[PDB]
């Protein structure tokens, strides 16, 4: 409805046209399993193309619908363990408390955090408490919204340094089929995204980002046209002539196949082009 | 409706929001007779100038006579013959310039000779265009202009690539029966030289009109047009430089219609 999204989720539809539906240089085979209403199992097997690094993950997710509890745990072949607990709507008027934790061998990740969010008709507030060993920090999210107009501010205060290390503003406007968003980070990093839905299934997205002094200019355009109710086709170009193609097709009620390819328009002949494959079985 | 415009007229609706409604640093005295009497007076050059035009109409037989005498005593002869040798075929001998062009339901053809060649194709609001300029004295093309866009009554998008070096774009929008909004963008490939600008034309009443531009160079443009009397439209304009507010050499103009 009119509930404003989180600061990290505004301008998401334009971002999903660029990201969703593309698998580059990866052989992704996932299997989803929902045996009961709450329990969900998901094991994935990916193989890198450039480095030939096979990575297999195992995720167990259970949902407690009555008490609002939500448990999420992830496992990986690299022993990169992650756990998340989400309590939603336990307190009055749409509250949510989340406990995240990620552990990794030798990479130096022993981080865990406590997230806190508040939602209403026009206000969306977020509070994070990262416990990184290098230094704890508090993240504050504030999003204003009324009549399709959005306004957001994000702040991260690092207690180890006793100062705010990042302060991001965001102003945007969105409709049912049109979304315009503007982002400025630390006064020097700027950005903007325009989401447009042309037809019943034609999503048009334009992304623009640059730094202070007309530097690091990066712009592009993406599209997500479907030809069939079961087939999705995606294409995107940027100023570096990187052309990304993607074709998503579900072959049967529980099988999904995704073909994708990245082409370097600068050097077509041996320019480091990438092919990707994605199989998602439903069970 | 379905007929496409020429290459010089595609994306004109968004351009009219920027161009029309402004007489900067100029006292343009205009008189419309149904004939064109326009007298331009620069406030900085201080050189009174006035040009006149006459047009004889023969609509039943399909010919027109045109002759214009400018201030600096230069005159140009121009005659056009259209819809005779073929439906939509239009010839023009201006000055001495020979202009030929074909206009149909989905194609706008044009071959100017003084050579310029343009072609515009249209289908369901989608427009493709390409124009070239071939210099016979240089034995090489000097301009290669390509454009493509999508046109609708309330929204118009237009892109431009001239000589493969400079890119451009324009957006037209009509959010109300009296409010308009146009966006402009142009830049050169391989360079940070960008040119971004937005304008609007608000119409308070059928006799009043207000316009406003702004540029990334902090060039603020304002314009108010009123029709206090039937047959006399007074338009006021002022150019404001945001870079030099004090002693910046700002330009204001005044236009009268009759
Ligand atoms: C419109 C808000 C201005 C943002 C200034 C940037 C300071 C971090
Ligand atoms: C609306 C587009 C703004 C472009 C900013 C200039 C990029 C260097
Ligand atoms: C319209 C896209 C052109 C990209 C060129 C920018 C780098 C020269
Ligand atoms: C909407 C595309 C704007 C690109 C500007 C690039 C300036 C170097
Ligand atoms: C009006 C309720 C919002 C409270 C923010 C601290
Ligand atoms: C909305 C708070 C801004 C702090 C810089
Ligand atoms: C609703 C039509 C939008 C075309 C860009």
Residue with tokens 């193989």: A47
CA-nearest of B226, B199, B156, B157 to B20 is B199
- Count of CA atoms in the C-beta half-sphere (13 A) of B60: 0
What are the distances in angstroms from CA A136 to CA A56, A83, A129, A195? 31, 19, 7, 36
Beta strands in chain B (DSSP E): 27-32, 36-41, 48-58, 63-69, 75-82, 89-94, 97-103, 107-113, 116-123, 126-135, 140-151, 155-162, 166-173, 179-188, 194-202, 208-215, 219-229, 232-241, 251-256
The SS3 call for residue B8 is coil
Distance CA B242, CA B253 (A): 18
Output DSSP code: residue B5: P
Q: How far does CA B183 lie from the centroid of its chain?
A: 16
Resolution in angstroms comes to 3.1
Residues followed by a break in chain A (C to N exceeding 2.5 Å) are none
Using CA atoms, how far apart are residues B18 and B31, in angstroms rounded to an integer?
Answer: 23
Residue A268 has φ and ψ, to the nearest 5°, of: -70, -40
Q: How far apart, in whole angstroms, are the C-alpha atoms of residue B20 and residue A283?
A: 64
Is A216 an interface residue toward B (CB < 8 Å)? no
Which helix H or strand E contains A12, and what residues bound it? helix A12-19
Written as six digits, the tokens of B250 are 């700002």
- Beta carbon of A198 within 6 Å of any ligand 7 atom: yes
Could you give the CA distance from residue B199 to residue B183 in angstroms, rounded to a whole number? Answer: 6
Cα separation, A85 vs A70, whole angstroms: 6
Burial class (CB in 10 A: 0-12, 13-18, 19+), A143: buried
DSSP state string for A188-220: TEEEEEEEEEEETTEEEEEEEEEETTTEEEEEE
* Length reported for chain A: 283
Determine the longest span between alpha carbons in chain B, in angstroms.
61
Measure A22 CA to nearest chain B CA, in Å: 28
Distance CA B147, CA B119 (A): 10
- Burial letters A173-186, b for 16+ CB under 10 A, else e: ebeeeebbbbbebe
Experiment used for this model: X-ray
Q: Which of A214, A215, A221, A240 to mutate to test the interface with B (most CBs of B within 10 A)?
A: A214
- Cα torsion A232, A237, A243, A244 to 10°: value is -30
Distance to chain A for B189, nearest Cα, Å: 10
Report the candidate in A172, A195, A182 with the shortest Cα–Cα distance to residue A15: A195
Residues B77, B83, B85, B90, CA torsion sign: positive
Contact B136, B153 (CB under 8 A): no
Contact A251, A1 (CB under 8 A): no
Residue A64, both tokens: 């407690």
Report how far residue B199's alpha carbon sits from residue B253's, in angstroms, rounded to the nearest whole number. Answer: 18
Both structure tokens of A242: 């990187």
Q: What is the dihedral of CA A47, A49, A50, A54, to 10 degrees?
A: 10
Compute the distance between CA of residue A72 and CA of residue B232 in angstroms, rounded to an integer.
75
Measured CA to CA, the distance from residue A7 to residue A172 in angstroms comes to: 11
**Residue A14 DSSP code:** H
State how far the Cα of B11 lies from the Cα of B4, in Å rounded to an integer: 11
CB B204 within 8 Å of CB B178:
yes
Contacts of B192 in chain A (CB under 8 A): 214, 217
CATH number of residue B55's parent domain: 2.40.160.10
Alpha helices in chain B (DSSP H): 12-19
Look up tokens 């304002």; give the residue: B222
Question: Are A181 and A192 a contacting pair, CB within 8 Å?
Answer: yes
- Using only the alpha carbons of chain B, give its radius of gyration: 21
φ, ψ at A24 (rounded to 5°):
-105, 130
Tell me the backbone φ, ψ of residue B17, rounded to 5 degrees.
Answer: -65, -35
Which residue out of B168, B170, B194 has the highest number of ligand 2 atoms within 8 Å of its CB and is therefore the one to mutate? Answer: B194
Q: Is A37 on the interface with B (CB under 8 A)?
A: no
Give contacts of A217 with chain B, Cβ < 8 Å: 192
Question: What is the C-alpha separation between B7 and B108, in angstroms, rounded?
Answer: 8
Structural domain including B187 reads 1-258
Q: How far apart are CA A113 and CA B256, in angstroms?
A: 69
Residue B216 contacts A, CB cutoff 8 Å: no
Q: Closest ligand 4 atom, CA of A206?
A: 1
Cβ neighbours of A214 in B, within 8 Å: 192, 194
The shortest C-alpha distance from A142 to chain B (Å) reads: 30
Report helix, strand or coil for B238.
strand
> What's the gap in Å between B248 CA and the centre of ligand 5?
48
Residue of A79, A108, A85, A81 whose CA lies nearest to A97: A85
CB atoms within 10 A of CB A213: 8
Q: Is the dihedral of CA B164, A211, A177, A241 positive or negative?
A: positive
How many CB atoms are located within 10 Å of the residue B168 CB? 17
Report which secondary-structure segment, H or E, holds A121: none
CA dihedral B88, B93, B95, B97 (to 10 degrees): 90
Any idea what DSSP says for residue B124?
Answer: T
Q: Say how many Å lie between the CA of residue A210 and the centre of ligand 2.
A: 8
Question: Token pair 């995240």 is at which residue?
Answer: A100
Q: Which residues of B122-158 are buried (b: 16+ CB within 10 A; e: fewer)?
A: beeeebebbbbeeeeeeeeeeeebbbbbebeeeebbb
* Contacting residues for A267 by C-beta, under 8 A, at least 6 apart: none
The token pair that represents A267 in the structure block = 């050097």
Interface membership of A217 toward B (CB under 8 Å): yes
**Closest by alpha carbon to A208, among A223, A200, A218?**
A218
- DSSP category for residue A104: -
Q: Is A19 helix (H, G, I), strand (E, B) or coil?
A: helix
Question: Using CA atoms, how far apart are residues A72 and A62, in angstroms rounded to an integer?
Answer: 7
Q: Are the C-beta atoms of B41 and B55 separated by less than 8 Å? A: no
d(CA B151, CA B173): 11
Q: Which helix (H) or strand (E) holds A82?
A: strand A81-88
Sign of the dihedral through C-alpha B173, B174, B178, B179: negative
Cβ atoms of A75 and A96 closer than 8 Å: no
**Distance from the alpha carbon of residue A49 to the mean position of ligand 4, in angstroms:** 33
Question: CA end-to-end span of chain B, whole Å?
Answer: 31
Residue whose C-alpha is closest to residue B43's, from B223, B218, B239, B234: B239
Tell me how many domains chain B contains.
1
Burial class (CB in 10 A: 0-12, 13-18, 19+), B111: middle
Closest residue in A to B190 (Cα–Cα): A239
A2 in ligand 7 pocket by Cβ < 6 Å?
no
Cα distance between the two ends of chain A: 31
Please tell me whether residue B18 adopts helix, strand or coil conformation.
helix
Exposure string over B216-245, b if 16+ CB within 10 A, otherwise e: eeeebbbbbbbbeeeeebebebbbbeeeee
Nearest to B156 by CA among B131, B177, B183, B129: B183
**CB neighbours of A110 closer than 8 A, spacing ≥ 6?**
A103, A133
């Amino acid at each position: 409805m009119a509930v404003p999204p989180t600061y990290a989720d505004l301008g998401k539809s334009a971002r999903d046209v660029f990201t969703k539906g593309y698998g580059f240089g990866l052989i992704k085979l996932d299997l989803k399993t929902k045996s009961e209403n709450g329990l969900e199992f998901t094991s994935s097997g990916s193989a890198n193309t450039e480095t030939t690094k096979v990575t297999g993950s195992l995720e167990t997710k259970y949902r407690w619908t009555e008490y609002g509890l939500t448990f999420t745990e992830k496992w990986n072949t690299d022993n990169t363990l992650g756990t998340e607990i989400t309590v939603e709507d336990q307190l009055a008027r749409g509250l949510k408390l989340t406990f995240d934790s990620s552990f990794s061998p030798n990479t130096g990740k022993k981080n865990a955090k406590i997230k806190t969010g508040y939602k209403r008709e026009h206000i969306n507030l977020g509070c994070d408490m990262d416990f990184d060993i290098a230094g704890p920090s508090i993240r504050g999210a504030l999003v204003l919204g009324y009549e399709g107009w959005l306004a957001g501010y994000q702040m991260n205060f690092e207690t180890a340094k006793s100062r705010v290390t990042q302060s991001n503003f965001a102003v945007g406007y969105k409709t049912d089929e049109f979304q315009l968003h503007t982002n400025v980070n630390d006064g020097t990093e700027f950005g903007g995204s325009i989401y447009q839905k042309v037809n019943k299934k034609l999503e048009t997205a334009v992304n623009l980002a640059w730094t202070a002094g007309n530097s690091n200019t990066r712009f592009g355009i993406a599209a997500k046209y479907q030809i069939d109710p079961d087939a999705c086709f995606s294409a995107k170009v940027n100023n570096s002539s990187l052309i990304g193609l993607g074709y998503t097709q579900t072959l049967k009620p529980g099988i999904k196949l995704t073909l994708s390819a990245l082409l370097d328009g600068k050097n077509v002949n041996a320019g480091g082009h990438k092919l990707g494959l994605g199989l998602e079985f439903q069970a």
